[PDB]
Amino acid sequence: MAYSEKVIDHYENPRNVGSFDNNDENVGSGMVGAPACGDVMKLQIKVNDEGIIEDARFKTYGCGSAIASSSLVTEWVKGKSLDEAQAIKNTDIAEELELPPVKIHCSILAEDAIKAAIADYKSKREAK
Template identity: 85%
Template structure:
């Protein structure tokens, strides 16, 4: 997951690259829409359970929503690291 953040710390855009099943792609796509307009800290509040519920993922596909949540955390961590936070 890649995020574009403005000077105020608000995510203006997000893009993803996922190699996986339809559930993984859908989870990543949903996350890109949900994080836009949020601050980086607000984006961290998005949980895999919310993603799974929104997409009505079956129990065997819950790991796809976990990957999407982990991608948010990684993108925010990378952003903060580059800013020296």
């Protein structure tokens, strides 16, 4: 009557790639490995013209039956600014996610992925 029927989306390209719609020019590149002979974590962000984080993305080894795992950071940085995301503290994501001391290292590897994505962005747009 008053409302129309927009275009529904479904079955379009893969997912869990670790990037928000291809790799823009304002996207941050970060690569932090675990405290050992492994390294398999990834975290990329998307900065807008205002120099603020508009989108967020990450990647990990995986396993199965996880359903949105370690995707708590992608929401934290989202809507925030690089200057703010740089103030993030492992203890925060570690105290909010709730985990044992044995898997505490996973709380530190997160922060690293933050700064990187930041210093990486301004590094690609530092051309003046």
